[PDB]
């Protein structure tokens, strides 16, 4: 199947500044018909399920800040976090939705420097 | 690795009549601490990503008309819907999100009896 990796685990930055995690899949999850990148990228605060963030690689999920944006094709993808707030403190997991069984990557924490 | 299984893979029932999804996982997910389930449901139609439907097995998120309904605990788990209404034609997922990796089921496609 599709495994799917990400990079850090975990990480920290001052309030304010820019953060970013990547995340890899195995195998491509790019669908030519439409041209689209079946990946998602999910914010998990603790004590809540996953949430979903960011879909089709780029697109942010209606209410999310456009603080977060989304990039990559193929097999690399990446999350970015343009001003870190105090709210944005949580765990981020990316996903694949191209083929089942759909799968998460490991998960990276983010955090408060 | 948790794995997640539902059946059927298909089915189909008349407008205005309930429809049930079964979903198994290989290992309870049922948290002992807080005693709740980490299980989900998610809705998905065709252009669109999965979209969160039902958490904690049995919480319905924002939304979502009360037609969904989530029961079961531990190791089985099941979807319903008391009655079906045209909007409600798609593929729908478990989700176990106790241990990571987080996992997926197979998917069920809902359809409408004509």
């Known amino acids: 199947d599709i495994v799917m990796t990400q990079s850090p685990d975990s990480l920290a930055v001052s309030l304010g500044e820019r953060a970013t995690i990547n995340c890899k899949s195995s195998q491509s999850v790019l669908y030519s018909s439409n041209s689209t990148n079946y990946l998602a990228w999910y914010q998990q605060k603790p004590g809540q399920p996953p949430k979903l963030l960011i879909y089709?690689?780029?697109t942010r999920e209606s209410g999310v800040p456009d603080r977060f944006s989304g990039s990559g094709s193929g097999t690399d993808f990446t999350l970015t976090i343009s001003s870190l707030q105090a709210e944005d403190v949580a765990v981020y997991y990316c996903?694949?939705?191209?083929?089942?069984?759909?799968?998460f990557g490991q998960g990276t924490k983010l955090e408060i420097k | 690795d948790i794995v997640m299984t539902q059946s059927p893979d298909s089915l189909a029932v008349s407008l205005g009549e309930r429809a049930t999804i079964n979903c198994k996982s290989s290992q309870s997910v049922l948290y002992s601490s807080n005693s709740t389930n980490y299980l989900a449901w998610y809705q998905q139609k065709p252009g669109q990503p999965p979209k969160l439907?039902?958490?904690?097995?049995?919480?319905?998120?924002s939304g979502v008309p009360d037609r969904f309904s989530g029961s079961g605990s531990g190791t089985d788990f099941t979807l319903t819907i008391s009655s079906l209404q045209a909007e409600d034609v798609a593929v729908?997922?478990?989700?176990?999100?106790?241990?990571?990796?987080?996992?997926?089921?197979?998917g069920t496609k809902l359809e409408i009896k004509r």
């Open positions: 996903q694949q939705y191209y083929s089942t069984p759909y799968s």
């Open positions: 089709w690689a780029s």
